[PDB]
Amino acid sequence: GRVLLVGKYRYHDLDELLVEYVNNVANKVELMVSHDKFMSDSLDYVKEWLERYSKANGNRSHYIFTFNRKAPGWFFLLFKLNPTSEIKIWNVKALPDGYLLANNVYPDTNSLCNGFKTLMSSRR
Amino acid sequence: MNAPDRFELFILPDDVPKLKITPDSRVPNCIIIKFEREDHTLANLLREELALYPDVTFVAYKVEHPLFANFVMRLQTEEGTRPKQALERACASIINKLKTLDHKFNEEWNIKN
Amino acid sequence: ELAILKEERTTTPYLTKYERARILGTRALQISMNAPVLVDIEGETDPLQIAMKELSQRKIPLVIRRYLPDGSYEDWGCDELIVD
Amino acid sequence: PLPVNLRRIIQNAQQIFHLDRAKASDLTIPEIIHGVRDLCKKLFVLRGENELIKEAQQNATSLFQCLVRARLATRRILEEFRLNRDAFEWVLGTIEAQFQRSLVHPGEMVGVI
Amino acid sequence: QVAGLNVNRNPKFWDIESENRDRQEEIDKQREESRESRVIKHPFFHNMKSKE
Amino acid sequence: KEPIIVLSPAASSLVRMSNVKEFLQEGKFLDPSKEPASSSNLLAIQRKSSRFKTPIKLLVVDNVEKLFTKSEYWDRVVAIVTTGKDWQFKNYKYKDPQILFQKFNGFYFKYKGDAVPASVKSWNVKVLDIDRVERFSDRQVVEQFWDTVENTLVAKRYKS
Incomplete structure (x- = not known):
């Protein structure tokens, strides 16, 4: 087909679609993996590690990222405010222009972390 | 039997544009102009007028075939000047030259009448 | 019998x-x-x-059968014949 | 009259690789000898491993091999033509390809011609 | 105007159920069609299943 | 400051980052479809020429989005490789292909015997043919490409 649509994104050829969408998504995924707050292990192990780290460091709120094995192309953001606070998981989508969290597009992982902290502060 | 009508030399069909302009991308700031139902009379006049402009670096024309009444002209100006403006300036300048020529001929004819 | 093996x-x-x-x-x-x-x-x-x-892309699905004078033949695929 | 023009190939190589200048060649003598010797065995007119086929193949290219060895001698290559390595493999490949292209095509009706 | 015949369709002497059943049989036959595979020429295109 | 050579990130390109080094430098052409994809978008090659006493080091860049933040980098561009696609030039210095191709050297690589795309014929780019079977002409094609590039480099009075 002369016109290709991937959600709201519109492309004109297979190569254009590939380069503009898939390469950017892969780069953002690598940036998320290379980020200091990433863990590719299983969700239960991520929850256990977060619980242990929060119990050991109950003076701060800890957030980590992990793979969304059920929904490919997504990420689970698990954050625990304190040992007494329940672990809350948020959904992050790997988009070509960045990461979509709470209907907000963040160009980079550090920008995503700053936005998450600002959202937590505002909701608090 | 196969001879075309003589009025096809100068009568323009409705679907055929008198003047089609297409850019020439091989060199910068160049256009190719296709004149329909015209011949050397207009082409040579325009070419020799444009050849004297300091901002026109290439001007040429050719009649592809004598049996078809059209010619194609290549024009290419400096960076500052758009070629179509140069073509318009050439047309206006030749019109003024012809106007003053007509006025002077009328004066001379009245004097010598 | 009449067909010639690919190796020969x-x-x-x-x-x-x-x-x-x-x-x-x-x-x-x-x-x-x-x-x-x-x-x-x-x-x-x-x-x-x-x-x-x-x-040009060697995608024609045809086979050339070249007949030798004695009646035997060789079958060449158009994807394995070199084209200039 | 002989196939594939060698002079044209050599001057094409000289123009392509800029074989002017007093620069010294990096083409060793054993490479020249072995390359020409191997080339004189890849001019296939007849395919097959049969001994009689090999004898006919050797007979069919005697004059052309004499021409090639006359032109691509060691002294002539190093001094008269001043080819470097890359020019040398290019010349060998071009000679082989052009010779393959100059053969007769099965199905010619040579009697009528 | 399709069933222009005046044939008495009384259930006592006419098997309406059989004719209806045959009618959905033939209508489902009409619904039946054919489908074939798609061929695309692209370096990164491969005719594989999801698991494949 | 090393000059820059820009390649098309298109998958149909005959010259990609995977096989650019063996082609432009070593003179041997390999089919890029069979070669594994290269993760690095920056590569460095060495060119040996009779015009220059010393080999020239050049940088090959596939994507200019992350490497052309400064405008002065465009002064180092000496060659552009395109696949005849308009969308390559969305983020370029001159988003129109024409002006880019009068202000930069454009090269299009095609197999011998294949038809040129229409947009390529409408642009001011060189056409370089690579044979599908014979591999001795790869050096000749590379030599033509480097002849054009070296002419541009000498015209720019580059210092090495």
Whole structure:
């Protein structure tokens, strides 16, 4: 087909679609993996590690990222405010222009972390 | 039997544009102009007028075939000047030259009448 | 019996001009008779041009059978014959 | 009259690789000898491993091999033509390909011609 | 105007159920069609299943 | 400051980052479809020429989005490789292909015997043909490409 649509994104050829969408998504995924707050292990192990780290460091709120094995192309953001606070998981989508969290597009992982902290502060 | 009508030399069909302009991308700031139902009379006049402009670096024309009444002209100006403006300036300048020529001929004819 | 094994084929490994012309004609006719096209067509519409495009990419699904004078023959695929 | 023009190939190589200048060649003598010797065995007119086929193949290219060895001698290559390595493999490949292209096509009706 | 015949369709002497059943049989036959595979020429295109 | 050579990130390109080094430098052409994809978008090659006493080091860049933040980098561009696609030039210095191709050297690589795309014929770019079977002409094609590039480099009075 002369016109290709991937959600709201519109492309004109297979190569254009590939380069503009898939390469950017892969780069953002690598940036998320290379980020200091990433863990590719299983969700239960991520929850256990977060619980242990929060119990050991109950003076701060800890957030980590992990793979969304059920929904490919997504990420689970698990954050625990304190040992007494329940672990809350948020959904992050790997988009070509960045990461979509709470209907907000963040160009980079550090920008995503700053936005998450600002959202937590505002909701608090 | 196969001879075309003589009025096809100068009568323009409705679907055929008198003047089609297409850019020439091989060199910068160049256009190719296709004149329909015209011949050397207009082409040579325009070419020799444009050849004297300091901002026109290439001007040429050719009649592809004598049996078809059209010619194609290549024009290419400096960076500052758009070629179509140069073509318009050439047309206006030749019109003024012809106007003053007509006025002077009328004066001379009245004097010598 | 009459067929010659692939290992002992001794004819030229190139597509002769007669074979090229016949292959192009046959493929063009087949395409004009609504045969499937094995290459992507950008904007081409002439069956001969589509056949030439197929030949350049070694995608023509035809076999040349070259007849030796004694009656034996060699079967060459158009995908394994070198074309200039 | 002989196939594939060698002079044209050599001057094409000289123009392509800029074989002017007093620069010294990096083409060793054993490469020249072995390359020409191997080339004189890849001019296939007849395919097959049969001994009689090999004898006919050797007979069919005697004059042409004499021409090639006359032109691509060691002294002539190093001094008269001043080819470097890359020019040398290019010349060998071009000679082989052109010779393959100059053969007769099965199906010629040579009697009528 | 399709059933222009005046044939008495009384259930006592006419098997309406059989004719109806045959009618959905033939209508489902009409719904039946054919499908074939798609061929695309692209370096990164491969005719594979999801698991494949 | 090393000059820059820009390649098309298109998958149909005959010259990609995977096989650019063996082609432009070593003179041997390999089919990029069979070669594995290269993760690095920056590569460095060495060119040996009779015009220059010393080999020239050049940088090959596939994507200019992350490497052309400064405008002065465009002064180092000496060659552009395109696949005849308009969308390559969305983020370029001159988003129109024409002006880019009068202000920069454009090269299009095609197999011998293949038809040129229409947009390529409408642009001011060189056409370089690579044979599908014979591999001795790869050095010749590379030599033509480097002849054009070296002419541009000498015209720019580059210092090495």
